[PDB]
């Protein structure tokens, strides 16, 4: 699955 | 030079989108041994995030090509490896600064959670490209860093604190992408979000935008990790 | 070897690692053999990105150096940083210009290649001109103009008005007149001519370059309206 | 100024 967003 | 001069130069680098310069400046500031201010702390974060972010982006591109391919695949493989080396050096650079300066010098809970989060992040990035008898250690290094930050944050920080919320976001990403544990990833994201939503009054005119953004990133990963 | 470096350059571009891409294409060019259209474009794209980055940064810091007049310590920092970027910018340009003088231009057998590399020569001297101040600027500006001028002549003589390389040359030549020579009317006249000339002969278009040509034509008029409104 | 479009 696609890359998740992060800080 | 001196702190202020290096901090301003790092601000210039960022404006010029020259994050190697920015990272180098903030690294020099950190190496001055003094606890970083919130401003300097954020500059260091942003700088290396961009620096490592580039190699991470490149890594995925080349990695996706190495698999979709003989003579070509061997070339792509060697190039991916080259990027990994850059990627790792960057991560180890950050992680070193964290062990020698940032984490130890962290006097307030806020600083402690922030740097522990950062430690988890870059071990996570190492984990992203780890394979073999190193991957396991790396993944546990990240988890333990995150876990400690998460504990401290729950005890010393309000649910709407940008640092706490940001920690939850990346911790959740770690569980999904690294540990392959969607439900755990989702639960952590959902909890941080819901807890913050129920207490939007604790927000600050100087951290509301950061907190609200992170909350949006949380839900985004959540919906991502459910629909297909 | 050629193929290996070219393939690696394709990889670098995919990874958006244009320093690697430029280095690969530089090695290909240095092999002394005339570059294919593919290799030529890889070299072009790579250095456009490499130099384009320093140029972007240069403008940001330069725009800050001016916006901090009266702020002595701030302005001095922006100035020094700007100077640092300039050095990188120049090295990149001189790198390209050297490749053009030693390999690309000389090895150019066809008019097409000749116009392309002469345009490229104009481009990077223009980039040098962008950050030139003092004695060196006058010479630099003339190098660019002379590169452009020869390319412009050859292109008009050997290429149809709708050729992407010819149109692209006209575009950058016009930008040179406006931004470097401070000659708006000349810049506009050159752009308007190239456009109208291409428009009158849209039959000379090619099923493999009509998109490039039409885009460049759009960029031409865009600069034209910019330099009026 | 506003940098004009080049190619």
Measure CB to CB from residue A2 to each of B166, B170, B224 and give the nearest one: B224
Nearest to B178, CA basis, from B206, B219, B148, B136: B136
> How many Å is the maximal CA-CA distance in chain C?
59
CB B18 within 8 A of CB C57: yes
Domain B1-228: which CATH number of 3.40.1190.20, 1.10.630.10, 1.20.190.20, 3.10.20.70? 1.20.190.20
What is the token pair recorded at B126?
């190492």
Cα angle C33, C37, C43; round to 5? 75
Contact of B1 with chain C, judged by CB distance below 8 Å, is answered with no
Distance of alpha carbon C22 from alpha carbon B186, whole angstroms = 43
Nearest Cβ partner for B61 among C14, C78, C81: C14
Give the chain D residue whose CA is nearest to the CA of C212: D7
d(CA B91, CA B129): 11
Q: In chain B, which residues are followed by a C-to-N distance beyond 2.5 Å, i.e. a gap?
A: 69
A1 contacts in chain B (CB < 8 Å):
224-225, 228
Interface of D with C (CB under 8 A): 1-7
Q: Do B75 and C4 touch (CB under 8 A)?
A: yes
Domain boundaries, chain C: 1-229
Please answer yes or no on whether B79 and C4 come within 8 Å at the CB atom.
no
To one decimal place, what's the resolution in Å? Answer: 2.3
Q: Under a CB-based contact definition with an 8 Å cutoff, are residues B197 and B222 in contact?
A: no
In this structure, CATH architecture of domain C1-229 = Up-down Bundle (1.20)
Any B CB within 8 A of C8 CB: yes
Torsion of CA B94, B98, B102, B105, to 10 degrees: -160
CA separation (Å) from C81 to B6, B40, B143?
12, 19, 40
Q: Which residue of C has its CA nearest to B61?
A: C15
In the three-class reduction of DSSP (H, G, I as helix; E, B as strand; rest coil), residue B159 is classed as coil
Strand residues in chain C grouped as ranges (E): none
What whole-number distance in Å separates Cα of residue B223 and Cα of residue B191?
Answer: 14
Sign for the pseudo-dihedral over CA of B45, C18, B124, B164 = positive
The burial class, CB within 10 Å (0-12 / 13-18 / 19+), for B147 is middle
Contact B43, B12 (CB under 8 A): no
d(Cα B125, Cα B222) in Å, to the nearest integer? 20
> How distant is the Cα of C46 from the closest Cα of chain B, in angstroms?
16
For residues B122 and B95, is the Cβ–Cβ distance under 8 A?
A: yes
Selecting from C59, C167, C175 the residue whose C-beta is nearest the C-beta of D4 gives C175
C15 burial level (CB within 10 Å; 0-12, 13-18, 19+): buried
CB contact under 8 A, A6 and B60: no
Interface contact flag, C179 D3, Cβ < 8 Å:
yes
Q: Which residues fall within 8 angstroms of residue A1, CB to CB, at 6 or more apart?
A: B224, B225, B228
CB C21 within 8 A of CB C39: no
| CA gap C216, C105 in Å, rounded | 23
Q: Looking at the complex, report in whole angstroms how far the Cα of residue D6 sits from the nearest Cα belonging to chain C.
A: 5
Q: Is B17 left (phi over 0), alpha (psi -120 to 50) or beta?
A: left
Residue B127 CA to residue B142 CA, distance in Å, equals 8
Contacts 24+ apart (CB under 8 A), C26-35: C26/C95, C26/C99, C28/C2, C29/C99, C29/C103, C29/C104, C30/C99, C30/C103, C31/C2, C32/C103, C32/C107, C33/C2, C33/C107, C34/C107, C34/C108, C34/C109, C34/C113, C35/C104, C35/C107
What are the b/e assignments for C160-193, b being 16+ CB within 10 Å?
A: bbbbbbbbbbbbbbbbbbbbbeeeeeebbebbbe
Q: Does B17 touch chain C (CB under 8 A)?
A: yes
Question: Do C64 and C80 contact (CB within 8 A), yes or no?
Answer: no
With beta carbons less than 8 A apart as the criterion, state whether B51 and B23 touch: yes
User: Which residues of chain C does D4 touch, with a Cβ-Cβ cutoff of 8 Å?
Assistant: 174-175, 178-179, 223, 226-227
Q: Residue C133, SS3? A: coil
Residues in chain B within 8 Å Cβ distance of C56: 16-17
Rounded to the nearest angstrom, the minimum Cα separation between B25 and chain C is 12
* Alpha-carbon gap, residue C11 to C17, rounded angstroms: 9
Q: Token match 């600050």: residue?
A: B204
Quick one: closest CA in C to B14, which residue?
C57
Dihedral of the CA atoms B22, B25, B28, B30 (nearest 10)? -60
Please tell me the distance from the alpha carbon of residue C80 to that of residue B185, in angstroms, as a whole number: 47
How many other CB atoms are there within 10 angstroms of residue B54's CB atom?
19
User: How many cross-chain Cβ pairs, C to D, lie less than 8 Å apart?
Assistant: 28
Question: Solved by what technique?
Answer: X-ray
């Amino acid at each position: 699955k696609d890359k998740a967003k992060s800080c | 030079m001196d702190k202020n001069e290096l901090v301003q130069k790092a601000k210039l680098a960022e404006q010029a989108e020259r994050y190697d310069d920015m990272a180098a400046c903030m690294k020099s500031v950190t190496e001055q041994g003094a606890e970083l201010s919130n401003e300097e702390r954020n500059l260091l974060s942003v700088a290396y995030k961009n620096v490592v972010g580039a190699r991470r982006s490149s890594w995925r591109v080349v990695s996706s090509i190495e698999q979709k391919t003989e003579k070509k695949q061997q070339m792509a493989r060697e190039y991916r490896e080259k990027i990994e080396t850059e990627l790792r050096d960057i991560c180890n650079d950050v992680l070193s600064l964290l062990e020698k300066f940032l984490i130890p010098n962290a006097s307030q809970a806020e600083s402690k959670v922030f740097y522990l989060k950062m430690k988890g992040d870059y071990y996570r990035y190492l984990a992203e490209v780890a394979a073999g008898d190193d991957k396991k250690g790396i993944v546990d290094q990240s988890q333990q860093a995150y876990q400690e930050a998460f504990e401290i944050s729950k005890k010393e920080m309000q649910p709407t604190h940008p640092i706490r919320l940001g920690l939850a976001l990346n911790f959740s990403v770690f569980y999904y992408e690294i540990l392959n544990s969607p439900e755990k990833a989702c639960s952590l994201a959902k909890t941080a979000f819901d807890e913050a939503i129920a207490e939007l009054d604790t927000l600050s005119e100087e951290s509301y935008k950061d907190s609200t953004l992170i909350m949006q990133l949380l839900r985004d990963n959540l919906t991502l990790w459910t629909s297909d």
